[PDB]
Ligand binder design. Structure first.
Ligand SMILES: NC(=O)c1ccc[n+]([C@@H]2O[C@H](COP(=O)([O-])OP(=O)(O)OC[C@H]3O[C@@H](n4cnc5c(N)ncnc54)[C@H](O)[C@@H]3O)[C@@H](O)[C@H]2O)c1
Ligand SMILES: NC(=O)c1ccc[n+]([C@@H]2O[C@H](COP(=O)([O-])OP(=O)(O)OC[C@H]3O[C@@H](n4cnc5c(N)ncnc54)[C@H](O)[C@@H]3O)[C@@H](O)[C@H]2O)c1
Lengths: 310, 308
């Protein structure tokens, strides 16, 4: 009865999850493509020790899109505090187990989707682990998603190995059929770019005639985007990905409580200055509004979803 | 539909229940929480919960889900701290932590696995099983008892104020048939029966009470036991009004199976009819086992014999 606009979203952990939780209530068909380059935490140990892609960002996305009883949702988010076992998320372990059974991370994700009554298609950026590397300004290379920000040098660029990393066929079809393509929100260097740099994905995005919106970071991240303005974020996407990837940039152009600023300053994070002249000079549209809530600083999934569709 | 309550542990209870659920019966399974070996044991110690393993298997035996979800629940990690653990155990452990209550966790997993029946733990807290040997020494822990290389005189449970669930006692009260076993005599059947209040409830019940006797001995537990030795042990621990009929495999076993079991110092339980009659119980004897190279009860035949 309703024509649902097809929307594809690229991201990682918490930014994607917050947005999807709201976007799923709109009249849209969602495809979420989730980075498999992380190597920290429970996800990272399971990645190394079981030889599977890191399941953590996928797990959160699945929970965000799930429609199950509150108890099952808690079960899936349960984190062991004792045991070898200590630190692991039960939902990661479920994903791990399903991936072992099927020998296929993408089939595992789709089986968990059925179990969690997920409305939408969740896909990994690749069916195998990706390793993220950072080239610093001095030319040195730091390897591993969670190691890059601890280098205390400035990132010049990031890139992925294995070089013959492949996206899922379904992923490329999703981009082809997309009415809207949303990039972010998430870490620039550790979530957005590791998705966009999968071979074939930029090419597919460029050929698409969908509207392409980049949801800009609201805060800098220490060791990743120290001192970045909004245009610095967009510039980095363009330098890695070329033209035809971003049409409009969505930015929080209003102020932030002093208490929140203070709390983020303790982690050497500060607000991303919105520099409108420089953004217009990069040739994209600017969607500026009150787009964040304090919940910690998160995007307002409803306002953002509605801005990306109106 | 007849109300049937079954007492057991691991594989024997699981094999029976898989068949019995297909009959017109309402099943209550009461599962030992005294085990301390394997993944179950490590989780028991490390997370301070009752051992989830025997319950996991019972839940899978009664489940009605797609084969994939069943495999997921039975998945065992081979690498990782994590290695050796069953994902189904981990699921029960997580649910128990969230609800702070093992029985409620089991009931939540029952809904998720579309379980046909009520699965209850023997108690909502861990039970420690102790074995007093003939020499008077005590060996503590379910998985240590058989390794003692001495002969068991009796077993008993701590904590002393171990309590069964109210729902368990109701189940016994309402039962039309009460089935004891199959399972290890000293590490599955007795640890269920000895929970304070359970034998009293069974004795008060007028339900028919059938004991499914072990087909094979177990080294370090029931070496040399006849069928009457098994029943006598139940009677010595539990008194009268617990067993009306004993169900036994009175027919022979393939030589290759005997040989495979003899490698583990296990041998067939000799059915001594005269001594069984002397203990005052009825004997239901038939071909009740099937052969992998492993020896299991024929759930269908057994189910039908106990419902007659
Ligand atoms: N979640 C969203 O809708 C949202 C929106 C826009 C941008 N982003 C961007 O994604 C990037 C990565 O985000 P993130 O997941 O690391 O979140 P974050 O930058 O808001 O906080 C960092 C993460 O570590 C913890 N944390 C560290 N510092 C914190 C702080 N000062 N206050 C509260 N929690 C803190 C939190 O658990 C959080 O997940 C950030 O630059 C952020 O601005 C997220
Ligand atoms: N499952 C049933 O329907 C059933 C039937 C009759 C008796 N029982 C009794 O319950 C008691 C304990 O049962 P159990 O689970 O330890 O079963 P078991 O006695 O058949 O074998 C021991 C366990 O280790 C394995 N195993 C060890 N030795 C084996 C052998 N050599 N050949 C094949 N498999 C072997 C089995 O899979 C089993 O889990 C035994 O006395 C047994 O006879 C169970």
């Amino acid at each position: 009865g309703m024509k649902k606009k097809n929307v594809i979203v690229f991201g990682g952990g918490t930014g994607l999850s917050v947005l999807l939780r709201g976007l799923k209530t709109f009249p849209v068909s969602i495809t979420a493509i989730v980075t498999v380059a992380d190597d920290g935490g429970s996800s990272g140990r399971l990645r190394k020790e079981l030889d599977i892609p890191p399941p953590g960002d996928v797990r959160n996305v699945l929970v965000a899109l799930s429609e199950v009883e509150p108890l099952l949702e808690q079960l899936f988010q349960h984190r062991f505090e004792n045991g070898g076992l200590s630190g692991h998320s039960l939902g990661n372990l479920l994903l791990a187990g399903m991936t072992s059974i099927t020998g296929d991370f993408a089939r595992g994700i789709s089986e968990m989707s059925k179990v969690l009554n997920v409305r939408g298609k969740v896909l990994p950026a690749s069916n195998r682990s990706i390793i993220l590397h950072g080239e610093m300004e001095d030319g040195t290379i730091v390897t591993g998603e969670s190691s890059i920000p601890k280098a205390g040098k400035k990132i010049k660029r990031v890139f992925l190995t294995p070089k013959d990393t492949k996206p899922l066929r379904e992923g490329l079809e999703a981009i082809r059929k997309a009415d809207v393509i949303v990039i972010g929100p998430g870490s620039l260097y550790t979530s957005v770019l590791p998705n966009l740099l999968v071979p074939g994905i930029c090419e597919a995005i460029k050929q698409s005639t969908a509207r392409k919106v980049y949801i800009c970071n609201v805060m800098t991240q220490n060791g990743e985007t120290d001192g970045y303005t909004a245009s610095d974020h967009l510039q980095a996407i363009m330098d890695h990905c070329g033209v035809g990837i971003v049409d409009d940039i969505l930015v929080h152009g209003e102020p932030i409580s002093d208490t929140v600023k203070a709390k983020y300053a303790k982690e050497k994070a500060e607000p991303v200055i919105v520099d409108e002249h420089k953004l217009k000079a990069l040739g994209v549209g600017t969607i500026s509004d009150y787009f964040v809530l304090e919940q910690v600083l998160r995007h307002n999934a409803s306002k953002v979803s509605e801005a990306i569709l109106e």
